[PDB]
Structure formats: C-alpha cells, structure tokens
Coordinates of C-alpha atoms in Angstrom, one line a residue:
Chain A
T1 CA 22.5 4.0 57.4
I2 CA 25.3 4.8 60.0
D3 CA 27.8 3.6 57.4
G4 CA 26.1 5.3 54.4
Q5 CA 24.4 2.4 52.9
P6 CA 20.8 2.8 51.7
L7 CA 17.7 1.4 53.3
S8 CA 15.4 1.4 50.3
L9 CA 16.9 -0.9 47.6
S10 CA 17.6 0.3 44.0
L11 CA 15.7 -0.5 40.9
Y12 CA 16.6 -3.4 38.6
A13 CA 14.6 -2.8 35.4
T14 CA 13.8 -5.5 32.8
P15 CA 16.3 -5.6 29.9
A16 CA 15.4 -5.8 26.2
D17 CA 13.9 -9.0 25.0
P18 CA 15.6 -11.1 22.3
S19 CA 13.9 -10.3 19.0
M20 CA 12.8 -12.8 16.4
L21 CA 14.7 -12.4 13.1
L22 CA 12.7 -11.9 10.0
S23 CA 13.5 -12.4 6.3
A24 CA 11.4 -12.6 3.1
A25 CA 11.4 -14.3 -0.2
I26 CA 10.4 -11.5 -2.5
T27 CA 9.4 -12.5 -6.0
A28 CA 9.5 -11.1 -9.5
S29 CA 7.9 -11.8 -12.8
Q30 CA 9.2 -12.2 -16.4
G31 CA 6.4 -12.6 -18.9
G32 CA 5.9 -15.4 -21.4
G33 CA 7.8 -15.4 -24.7
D34 CA 6.1 -13.9 -27.7
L35 CA 5.4 -16.6 -30.3
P36 CA 7.6 -16.3 -33.4
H37 CA 6.8 -16.0 -37.0
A38 CA 5.9 -19.4 -38.6
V39 CA 7.7 -20.5 -41.7
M40 CA 6.3 -23.0 -44.2
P41 CA 8.5 -26.0 -44.8
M42 CA 9.1 -28.1 -47.9
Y43 CA 8.5 -31.4 -46.3
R44 CA 5.1 -33.0 -45.5
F45 CA 3.7 -33.3 -42.0
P46 CA 5.3 -36.6 -40.8
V47 CA 8.8 -35.6 -41.8
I48 CA 8.8 -32.2 -40.2
Chain B
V1 CA 18.2 0.9 -10.9
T2 CA 15.4 1.6 -13.3
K3 CA 13.4 4.0 -11.0
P4 CA 15.9 5.9 -8.8
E5 CA 13.2 8.4 -8.1
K6 CA 11.6 5.8 -5.8
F7 CA 14.9 5.6 -3.9
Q8 CA 15.4 9.3 -3.2
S9 CA 13.6 12.2 -4.9
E10 CA 16.8 14.0 -5.8
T11 CA 18.8 11.0 -7.1
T12 CA 17.8 10.4 -10.8
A13 CA 20.7 7.9 -11.1
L14 CA 21.7 5.4 -8.4
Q15 CA 25.2 6.0 -7.3
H16 CA 28.2 3.8 -6.3
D17 CA 28.6 5.8 -3.1
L18 CA 29.0 4.6 0.5
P19 CA 25.9 6.6 1.7
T20 CA 23.9 4.9 -1.1
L21 CA 25.3 1.5 0.1
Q22 CA 24.2 2.3 3.7
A23 CA 20.7 3.3 2.5
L24 CA 20.5 0.1 0.4
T25 CA 21.2 -1.7 3.7
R26 CA 18.5 0.1 5.5
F27 CA 16.1 -0.5 2.6
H28 CA 16.8 -4.2 2.6
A29 CA 16.5 -4.3 6.4
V30 CA 13.0 -2.8 6.4
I31 CA 11.9 -5.0 3.5
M32 CA 13.0 -8.2 5.3
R33 CA 11.4 -6.7 8.4
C34 CA 8.1 -6.5 6.5
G35 CA 8.0 -10.3 6.3
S36 CA 5.1 -11.9 4.4
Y37 CA 4.0 -8.5 3.0
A38 CA 7.3 -7.6 1.6
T39 CA 6.8 -8.1 -2.1
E40 CA 3.4 -6.5 -1.7
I41 CA 5.1 -3.4 -0.1
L42 CA 7.6 -3.4 -3.0
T43 CA 5.0 -3.6 -5.7
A44 CA 3.0 -0.8 -4.0
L45 CA 6.2 1.2 -4.0
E46 CA 6.6 0.5 -7.7
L47 CA 3.4 2.4 -8.0
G48 CA 2.3 5.3 -5.8

C-alpha cells in the first residue's frame, strides 16, 4: 500500500496433527518341561 | 543378544556402546509403532 503493507494476505498453513501413541505387548514362549526319569519306590501304591 | 547378525550385519556381538543404545531405542520405537503385528514382525525377523 502507500505505507508498505500488503493487499493480498499471507498463508497460514495447517500445523501437524497430534499423533496417537502406540505400544505393543510382544510375547515369548518357553516350552514345556521334559518329563523326568521314573524311579520305582519300595512302598505300595496308597503310601506313595 | 543371541543373534546379533539380525541387529547389524557387521556386529557379531552386541556391544555396550552409546550408538548401540540409540539403535536399541529406534528398534524398540519401530516395534511399538508396529502395534498388533509387532510380535509377528519380530518372529519374521527371527527368520528371514
């Protein structure tokens, strides 16, 4: 203008959106235990 | 720890460095960014 001020206004672009925070419950695997060696007792079945 | 080749192809033993710590951070960030597929991406990275 006569003072040096613009006629066509400036751009005001859209800022970045707030994101959604993400996590994860990652999982592992330990196997089952190997069954041991059986030992014959000296007592009968009700006692042992 | 057990497969440091899956971390970087030159490593062959995971280090106690600060760049290794920063890369662990980026690794954890991308895994938690994967969301529900994260353990699936990890078990695919276990394999090739």
